[PDB]
Ligand code: HEM
């Protein structure tokens with residue numbers, strides 16, 4: 001715990017540790033939701049992780065993500081060392097500088113790309129699920145949640161499958177550091193990997209996402225190698241450590257809730273709406289911003305260079321946005337959330353994400369309608385910039401499945 005800065009009033013202190021939250025045994029969303037109990041102010045200072053602000057409510061989270069002039073994305077990760085070294089494109093750039101790079105990224109992950117990739121997504125999902133189906137069990141995290149989205153990404157990026165273990169390791173250090181590498185070291189090693197590949201595909205372009213990004217136009221000129229590198233690196237992080245975690249929270253839920261499963265079994269057309277509700281309830285991202293100036297925000301005095309965590313996860317969990325937030329209701333009339341961010345840096349990968357999520361649920365519920373958590377397994381979660389599931393052993397009766 002870092003010493004309380006003089007400008008922070010004592011009543012605002014709430015020592016939440018985003019990488020190791022107190023109530024994690026209750027579930028990661030539950031752990032973070034302690035920030036929304038009535039004894040916690042809308043904006044608190046934690047002395048954890050070097051010390052930083054945390055907005056706990058949708059209203060503030062959205063406002064802050066909209067006001068980039070006060071809350072710059074130049075340093076979007078806690079701790080400070082990580083935000084300092086963070087230089088991915090487009091995320092580390094404030095408007096309007098980021099727009100040109102978002103456009104370029106949309107050429108590799110935008111809706112049109114996702115629609116043309118849907119056949120491979122379905123293919124891979126079906127193949128993996130059918131391989132699992134007669135077995136009557138799986139380790140969900142390593143048997144599906146990882147290889148499915150990750151292989152689609154590697155296919156899109158035209159990168160070798162044998163590189164997955166190295167890259168997945170590196171991306172996880174940036175989001176959930178185990179202590180072996182600082183964010184800066186993880187980033188530089190990912191850059192080490194990408195540099196020669198980017199040079200080769202600028203010399204001899206293929207048709208893959210890296211070739212497209214590394215040879216695109218920004219700002220009336222060719223993209224530089226350095227920009228290409230910083231953009232491709234963020235695309236790797238997106239591809240390897242988002243949907244990978246989210247599918248496990250969803251499948252854990254569905255394993256544990258036969259009644260919700262039955263809903264989607266009986267009425268498969270609901271799966272898209274259900275997916276969005278799962279996106280709210282099992283939201284998993286938490287980054288933020290850095291103060292560009294002294295600023296009074298909702299009667300709280302913030303100083304230039306204060307960091308503020310703005311957990312995208314919390315907005316949809318806020319009972320001010322959704323009545324009975326912890327309860328899953330597929331029928332929920334307005335599913336309010338900021339699971340995919342807010343403002344100028346809205347997730348670019350969210351169409352790929354949704355398609356992967358919806359393809360997975362529809363195919364799994366068709367082939368393996370009835371499944372459960374393996375006997376006496378206790379599911380443990382993990383927290384960080386992106387939260388996750390440690391392990392998800394699942395079982396089912398192969399005679400109940402359909403080939
Ligand atoms: C469940 C899946 C996903 C979630 C929850 C998620 C979440 C988010 C969030 C919260 C942000 C805003 C970050 C900020 O403002 O600092 C963001 C931006 C971004 N996401 Fe995703 N994402 C997902 C899938 C993906 C995928 C699969 C990719 C890559 C294919 C991706 C690529 C990106 C990129 C490149 C940005 C930066 C956009 C910009 O800075 O203009 N996302 N995402």
Ligand SMILES: *SCC1=CC(C)(C)N(O)C1(C)C
Pocket residue numbers: 037038039
């Ligand atoms: S109103 C929620 C709440 C906060 C705190 C004061 C910690 N509590 O004891 C309850 C659970 C009443």
Ligand SMILES: *SCC1=CC(C)(C)N(O)C1(C)C
Pocket residue numbers: 179180181
């Ligand atoms: S903690 C073990 C370790 C440290 C570092 C030098 C970053 N590594 O490459 C490994 C993961 C072996």
Ligand SMILES: CC1(C)[C@@H]2CC[C@@]1(C)C(=O)C2
Pocket residue numbers: 088091175234237238242285286287385386
């Ligand atoms: C916070 C994110 C999910 C978003 C895309 C990947 C990620 C870890 C970032 O650095 C920006």
Ligand SMILES: [K+]
Pocket residue numbers: 074075076083084085086087092
């Ligand atoms: K930075």
